[PDB]
Amino acid sequence: AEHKPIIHKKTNRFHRPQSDLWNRVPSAWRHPRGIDSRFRRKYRGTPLHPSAGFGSDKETRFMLPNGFIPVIVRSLKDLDMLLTKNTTHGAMISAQVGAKLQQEIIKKAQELNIEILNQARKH
Amino acid sequence: MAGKKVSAISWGTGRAKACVPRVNGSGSNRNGQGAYANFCRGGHRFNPPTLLRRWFRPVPSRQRKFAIASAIAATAVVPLVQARGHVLGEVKEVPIVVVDAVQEIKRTRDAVELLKKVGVYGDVQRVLDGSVHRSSKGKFRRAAYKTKKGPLVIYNEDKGIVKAFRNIPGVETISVKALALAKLAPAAQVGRLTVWTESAFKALDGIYESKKRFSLPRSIMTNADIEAVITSDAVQSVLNEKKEVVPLPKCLSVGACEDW
Amino acid sequence: GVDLDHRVPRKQRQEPKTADAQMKMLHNLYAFLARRTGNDFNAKIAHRLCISRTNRRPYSLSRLATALNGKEAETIAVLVAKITNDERLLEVPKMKVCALKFTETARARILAAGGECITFDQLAQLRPTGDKCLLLEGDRTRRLVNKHFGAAPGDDNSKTRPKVASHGRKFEMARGRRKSRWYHA
Amino acid sequence: VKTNPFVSSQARKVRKSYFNAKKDAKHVAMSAPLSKELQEANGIKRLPIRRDDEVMIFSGRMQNRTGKVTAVKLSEMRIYVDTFTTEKINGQAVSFPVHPSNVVITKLKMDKARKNLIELRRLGRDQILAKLGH
Amino acid sequence: VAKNNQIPNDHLRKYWYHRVKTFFDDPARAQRRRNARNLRAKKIAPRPAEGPLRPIVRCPTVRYNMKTRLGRGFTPKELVAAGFDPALARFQGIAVDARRAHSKDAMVKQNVERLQAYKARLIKV
Amino acid sequence: AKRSNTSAHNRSHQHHRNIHKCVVKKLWFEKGMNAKFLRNARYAKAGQNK
Amino acid sequence: PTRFHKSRKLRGQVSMGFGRVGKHRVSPGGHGRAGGQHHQRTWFDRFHPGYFGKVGMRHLHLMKNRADEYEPTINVDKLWTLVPEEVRVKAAAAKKGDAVPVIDCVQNGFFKVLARGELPKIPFVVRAKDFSEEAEKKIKAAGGVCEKV
RNA sequence: AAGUCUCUAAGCAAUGGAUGUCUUGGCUCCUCACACGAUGAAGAACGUGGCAUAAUGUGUUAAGUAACCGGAGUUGCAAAC
RNA sequence: ACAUCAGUUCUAUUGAACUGAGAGUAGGGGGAUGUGGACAUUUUUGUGAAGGUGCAAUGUGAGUUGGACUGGAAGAAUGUC
RNA sequence: CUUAAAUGAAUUAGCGUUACAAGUGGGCUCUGACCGGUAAGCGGUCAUGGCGAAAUGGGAUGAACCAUACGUCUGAAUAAG
RNA sequence: UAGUGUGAACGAAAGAUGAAAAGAACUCUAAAACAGAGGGUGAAAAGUUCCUGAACUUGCUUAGGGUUAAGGCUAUUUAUAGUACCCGUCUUGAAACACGGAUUAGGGAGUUUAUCUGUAGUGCGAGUCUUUGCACGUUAACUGUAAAGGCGUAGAGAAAGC
């Protein structure tokens, strides 16, 4: 389909403060509540906070490098959801789904023309 | 009395240990170990479920009698029953009433031979194929696979009918005299597929006439939907015309600036 | 940098907080009219359906007989509330009424004297303009909780009724309430 | 669905009763169907297994051999058999245990109690099929 | 104490939390009662289980003069008027009460007619 | 021990966040006023309606 | 239940909505009604005035089935509510003669009668224990009788 | 301006026992019962099995014996029936 | 140019066009993510479930998802509780 | 009841009323006014502002002074300096 | 139970091979029941406190950085430029020569009851609640129902009386 050039506004993931230093601290973001914290204050040479400023365009949200918005597909019955919205959304088959039913979902998709985003399972 | 079985006195400051309670005695290795606190290993947990607790909710009896009325109303109305998750197919009309000679059925060949003729055995086939798993640890205490809740069958009196339908997966017998939400609207989802008997079905106007405190609930509207009311010419003549927003230009307005 | 006062002092209820079909439905009927016809009557009926159940006070049937005494026939008493019958009123007049619900005692009384029992979606066909209608409302302060509201008791004179389980002597009648025991409020 | 309250339907209780049953119940739990030659002869499907008789297993490494029962085991809950042997890495045959519900009984040897059990179940099976009406 | 709430009146200064009494017995208690009175009525047969017969009796104080309830037992006067043997009438299935002697003439005429309806269709095995 | 006794630094700030003008209900205050005046003002009203 | 509490959203926040400087602690004031004449007096004075002190006359062995305490009341405007509505419609169509219906208050649990509102001009007979002055006056004016018990 | 040193990352290991999955164990609620003992109880000690220390049976008739009721090997090796 | 939160003009059925604003400790409100178990509804799995290790996307973010290696039997989704 | 005549400063703005509840009840300080003190980065008050809870730039460096109070970015021209 | 104390007393840690022991014969180096290496068993070594086998720490191999203690953020032609004090905490004020903090995993703290308050939702409405209990039951549920009782419907007064 037709759309804008996709542009992300931030490239990388946000780290928690002091997470680089310590293995106990996981690098998933947490808003710092320290009273004397430099980070809460926003001094220079701290990372910028995640916030509604960084929100991507309402058109291009959840959109892949390809073009299509990935809906997850768990079975043959769930593939009926993408019949209406054919060239806006696109399929993404689950990791649980085994090698036999993988081939059946591809064969069903090539009939109905739904682009499957999962790639190179192998064999 | 759990976790407080141990002795424990809390040492004090001076020893460069935290002031938490510590079990006393010597040589066990257990001794000199923190105990009696929620954070300690084998301490009393923070407020686990008590008998003190209120378990049962006294739900008002008018509102109980309201809900069995609305669930029986919803057992008609063929949008709702398939919107739960049924395979009623054809015939598509609901409810299904059945002649009272079926109430004398004894053996289960006849009860299965009933359901496929009236066209309900699609919903029994939905139970038999396609079992449903318990992802959780609940498997240790209550059976690894659940079963689907299929049709429902109602009779005023039992003549071995209960024995006949018992043992077929997914069908739940009730008397008309009882009735219940757990049967009629399971998981608070109205419209289960009901197979009435004639003697059950003809009782219902007798039942709900002569119930003591309850009386039968009114609606606020007279109609089902609005769209007939607005589109009528009685309303439409009075309305103003439907407006729509102009988008505004971004730009020499004036006809002669060159006089200046 | 701009000098404004960013705070909101006043919220107002826009749509109803009920999770019914029917109250939400016939709100949108009278919301649709209140916009489009551009009229003071339908704007009020729209807003009355928004407001909580405490403010929709139950307008009793003897108050309905007093309002309509004088007013000629083909005049509906529109009323965004429940109607409840009076024991003490004896012979009801023949009267045309519209409300959300009646009590089953009151509906028997109005119908038995040749009256009418009209719904709001029924009324939207009949009278979109509200010509020869009559909006009525119960008084807001008739609730018992409302008597506890006001200046704190003991302000000389609050007349506000202190929050008490048990009445009589012994419970809150001495040092404060009477001038013998030091002072009177 | 069960009506009798005194029998339990919890999995904890049933396994504990099953593994720590009395000796007489464990012999009944160790049982197998007859081959169709013996079904028409004696008039029963199901019987408990002894050290006299011999048995025949479909599906396995030891697929489709007859062989006599050397030992029943009620704690270990399995049956040793003649013929059913893999050798060790040492030149030494060791008999290999198999659960009887996988297995069909090909020949049977009588006992006063075994004949007295069979004459009961024959008369029982005549009553029940007349009741159901097949 | 804070805000506009009423004075804090909770009778919870004793160690109530040791002396707790939970009523999860109640529906099992219902069956222990119910299975008793069925194991009664079989043993009592052929005699009627809803008995023994008891008098109609006016309640005492000013605000229950209206109402009439079941008493304990009939007087020795009321039995002899009706046609009964005071001592033996216990074993005929009629409760007897020697003490009550404030019952005036109106309520005697009920209780004589009450016993006559019993004695009309009592029969002996 | 010895901490501050008072301040008025930001009394003004708080007062002005909201100096609401409390309006009087009516100019007569019949608890006060002359009884001899109000006594006659009753008999003006009582005589008129008859 | 436990999902909808404000406590659940205050994870991460360190004080759980109870302050840093004050520190939420078990006995600020003292227990229950404590310091009512001292340091919590302002609460008592402001919200529940008259709490302290003794007034009245001591009553020993009060019973409420006596006909000294126990008087339920009913009003003149009703009474007709006690009787069903078929009765008084027949009683309206009657001569100055016979068959005037007896509204028994005492059976229904109402001893005294009290005139707050109107009646019609139907004849009737009130059996009750007591009346007011104005209730006795209104029942005469309707055209009916005041029996005592 | 040197590094086999030190710092960071990835892959294969060592150490360690988290996670996930299992469950003949708990916990609670309800039901039924309480009929221990000078006819020697509860508790303690020591004996006793072919290889048996603890526990469990059991008391020089000592993993038992007799009678009645079940009714064929209730486990490693050895032995007998 | 883009995001968010308000508001203004309109709109039935959840939207449209346009304008304005931007710190935040103690603290309050709104919407959302994740975990143990439950009741419905729908599935996945020895053609390899959960788990674990690295990598590439995706969401402002809490998170979520793909494919590779390891593992060898169960897991997950949607709506309410 | 009514006989006359009008909306009779500027600039701005919708205004009124109720209920429930959090935190708080150690403050510090620039510029002026002031009490005590030889004086103090001392003690105690007053008026507006600031910090506490306010980033960024400037005073090399600094909670408080100057410019200015902040969504994510791309430029232009400036403020203090 | 192990174990501690003269004693009254005190009191741990510790589950999982595989479907089945098929629990690793025999040979070679060696002083050898040291320790391996061949060769085999099994679907797969899962090889004896043996399922999965995370982090901290360590070893080997591969690739780069290093006078700036290291780490972070922004920007690109990827080793440079600019920037960047250590978090949590009481405090008017913390990078402080204030206190807590060697590393990692797993546990770890506003919950529930009674008597009330106010707001919102729901049902009935001068009424309302059906529960103590009885009758039912596919049985602690659900369902049906008689009569009391609770609060409301009239208040003021110390009280008589009203």
PDB file of C-alpha atoms (C1' of nucleotides) in Angstrom, chain J residues 6 10-11 14 20 22-23 25 29 36 38 60 62 64 72:
ATOM      1  C1'   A J   6     -32.417  54.829  29.234  1.00  0.00           C
ATOM      2  C1'   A J  10     -11.261  52.801  31.400  1.00  0.00           C
ATOM      3  C1'   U J  11      -9.150  47.792  30.538  1.00  0.00           C
ATOM      4  C1'   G J  14     -18.469  33.484  32.389  1.00  0.00           C
ATOM      5  C1'   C J  20     -15.188  13.743  50.092  1.00  0.00           C
ATOM      6  C1'   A J  22      -4.364  13.473  50.625  1.00  0.00           C
ATOM      7  C1'   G J  23       0.235  15.665  52.157  1.00  0.00           C
ATOM      8  C1'   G J  25       2.068  22.063  60.903  1.00  0.00           C
ATOM      9  C1'   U J  29      17.120  33.180  51.256  1.00  0.00           C
ATOM     10  C1'   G J  36      19.035  42.988  69.854  1.00  0.00           C
ATOM     11  C1'   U J  38      31.582  45.170  68.695  1.00  0.00           C
ATOM     12  C1'   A J  60      35.876  30.025  35.580  1.00  0.00           C
ATOM     13  C1'   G J  62      28.474  27.714  43.546  1.00  0.00           C
ATOM     14  C1'   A J  64      19.442  31.547  46.544  1.00  0.00           C
ATOM     15  C1'   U J  72      10.646  15.119  20.351  1.00  0.00           C
TER      16        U J  72
END
